[PDB]
A paper describes a structure:
Aurora A is one of three human aurora kinases, a family of serine/threonine kinases that play a central role in cell division. During mitosis, Aurora A is localized to microtubules in the mitotic spindle through an interaction between the kinase domain and the protein TPX2.15 The N-terminal sequence of TPX2 binds to an allosteric pocket on Aurora A16 and stimulates kinase activity, leading to cell-cycle progression. Interruption of the Aurora A–TPX2 interaction reduces kinase activity, leading to mislocalization of Aurora A, mitotic defects, and cell cycle arrest. In previous work, some of us have described the development of small-molecule inhibitors targeting the TPX2 binding pocket of Aurora A.18 In particular, through a process of high-throughput screening of diverse chemical libraries and fragment deconstruction, the fragment 2-phenyl-4-carboxyquinoline (compound 1) was developed.
A process of synthesis and investigation of structure–activity relationship (SAR) trends was embarked upon to improve the potency of the fragment, mainly through increasing the hydrophobicity of the phenyl group which occupies the pocket formed by residues L178, V182, V206 and L208. In general, it can be seen that adding halogens at the position X is predicted to be favorable. In order to check the orientation of the small molecules in the binding pocket, we have collected X-ray crystal structures of 2 and 5 (see the ESI†). In contrast to the MC simulations, both crystal structures clearly show that φ is close to 180°. The discrepancy is possibly due to force field inaccuracy, crystallization conditions, or a small population of alternative conformations may not be visible in the X-ray electron density. It is more difficult to assign the orientation of the L178 side chain, and so the inter-conversion between the two populations observed in the MC simulations may be accurate. As predicted, compound 9 also shows enhanced activity relative to 2.
Residue numbers in the entry: 127 to 285, 290 to 390
The structure:
Amino acid sequence: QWALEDFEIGRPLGKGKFGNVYLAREKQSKFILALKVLFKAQLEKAGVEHQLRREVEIQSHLRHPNILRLYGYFHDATRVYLILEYAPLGTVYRELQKLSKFDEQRTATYITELANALSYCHSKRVIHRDIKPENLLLGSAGELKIADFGWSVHAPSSRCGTLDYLPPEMIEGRMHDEKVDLWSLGVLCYEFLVGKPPFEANTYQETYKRISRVEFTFPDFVTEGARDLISRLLKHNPSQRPMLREVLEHPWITANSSKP
Ligand SMILES: Nc1ncnc2c1ncn2[C@@H]1O[C@H](COP(=O)(O)OP(=O)(O)OP(=O)(O)O)[C@@H](O)[C@H]1O
Ligand SMILES: O=C(O)c1cc(-c2cccc(F)c2)nc2ccccc12
Ligand SMILES: [Mg+2]
Ligand SMILES: [Mg+2]
């Protein structure tokens, strides 16, 4: 259905572990899109060909204003091509670098959109397991959009990078469910307000200890409504974390998030 012939390749949009993302335009419709390239050599050597097919199937069946659309895909003699929706405002990661911290309005709005998207994700019983600011893009009106889906799967499961966003049941090799995403939401909220995630360390081996113990402290400026929600999401026992409906209705979310 799709071949590389059908697009014109603009500038690079970012580097992934297995290749680049380029700006691109469909020649006959003039549609603007992002076109992720992955190299088959490196995909074979790493052994993720089947894992990538799992990402591609889960993502093409999702449609939500805060999930990044996958339109299609194709491959050739040496590479695989994912045709993704183009997010014109870049990543949340670069927004943090430029501003250092976020105010409570931006944070509570981002947490809302994140929780909405993860609610829909769970209704199709999909778990993302890897929401990093690296993987949260921003639409042309500033809306938050989840991307990647590289390490995502169906609940439950038990299948690299930094430990920082992984919950304790995952880093301990144990079995994990849909509350993996609730711990992740707690980590982002912290990082959005503070400028660094709550378990950062300069070594992998200490981030392990600090996640496992849940050893973290708030600085002065974090108001008590935000300490309340974060502490309720960063709980070693998965069952003691709330569900997304409680998050969407937390007094701190409602007072600071923007309206529908
Ligand atoms: N649709 C897009 N629009 C703009 N920038 C993007 C888009 N998709 C990705 N990027 C940028 O390119 C980078 C790499 O993309 P991505 O995270 O999807 O690759 P990856 O992490 O290597 O995926 P994989 O799990 O398959 O190895 C991102 O960190 C982001 O900065
Ligand atoms: O055997 C293949 O031709 C092949 C196909 C694909 C591929 C094609 C469509 C979708 C998708 F997710 C992956 N990925 C690969 C990765 C490494 C080595 C070979 C391949
Ligand atoms: Mg094959
Ligand atoms: Mg990524």
